[PDB]
Amino acid sequence: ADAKALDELRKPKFSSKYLIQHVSQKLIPAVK
């Protein structure tokens, strides 16, 4: 799927950051 539950995914809900701060340390060499 519906829309009104899917507009709520525009908000940050992660409640942990052991991936979002990890991937930027390894995305840019992998795409370069």
Partner: protein, 193 residues
């Protein structure tokens, strides 16, 4: 084979991923783990433009898509279900489905914790006894021992009482619908008598 059954049936090909993602994370008891892991990618797709290029741009080769997702997820202690999930979507180019798997993973997680998000609209803000009256009055609308999570809003156009907005259905226990339904019943009864 022998998987735990999903809490509720769902739609096609995007919720069927999230049903299967729930059905293997329940055998691992990592239901709250990957629901946190799915949410981190949604902010990750919000940050980097070279990462959501792998889900929208149709000119990246399907080798370079499946290598970059593996070359990032070698590490960080992400769950082995999700690093098997993202390699399944990167081989098929279904990385765009993650925004729709997550909203279908949510209500599977919601019906596993048996919570239902409702919304209460009253004429005035409540007491602490009026809330425990309202909770057991509104517990007759859910179909099991569901932990009701209320939200509170105010409309003085209602002249007392409450309505519940379950986002599927609505029950109007207000006195405004009570008096207009009363007047409809009276004015239709004198239509015959």
């Amino acid at each position: 084979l022998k998987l735990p059954t999903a809490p509720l049936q769902l739609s096609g090909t995007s919720a069927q991923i999230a049903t299967l993602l729930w059905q293997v994370a329940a055998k691992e008891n990592q239901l709250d783990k990957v629901q946190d892991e799915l949410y981190q990618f949604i902010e990750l797709f919000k940050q980097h433009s070279e990462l959501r290029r792998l889900a929208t741009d149709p000119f990246v080769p399907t080798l370079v898509r499946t290598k970059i997702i593996s070359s990032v997820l070698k590490d960080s202690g992400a769950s082995e279900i999700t690093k098997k999930l993202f390699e399944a979507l990167a081989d098929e180019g279904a990385l765009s489905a993650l925004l729709e798997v997550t909203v279908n993973y949510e209500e599977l997680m919601l019906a596993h914790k048996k919570e239902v998000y409702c919304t209460v609209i009253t004429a005035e803000p409540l007491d602490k006894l009026e809330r425990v009256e309202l909770t057991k009055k509104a517990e007759k609308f859910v179909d099991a021992g569901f932990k009701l999570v209320m939200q509170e809003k105010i409309d003085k156009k209602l002249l007392g009482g409450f309505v519940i907005e379950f986002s599927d259905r609505r029950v109007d226990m207000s006195t405004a619908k009570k008096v207009e339904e009363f007047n409809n019943f009276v004015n239709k009864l004198v239509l015959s008598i």
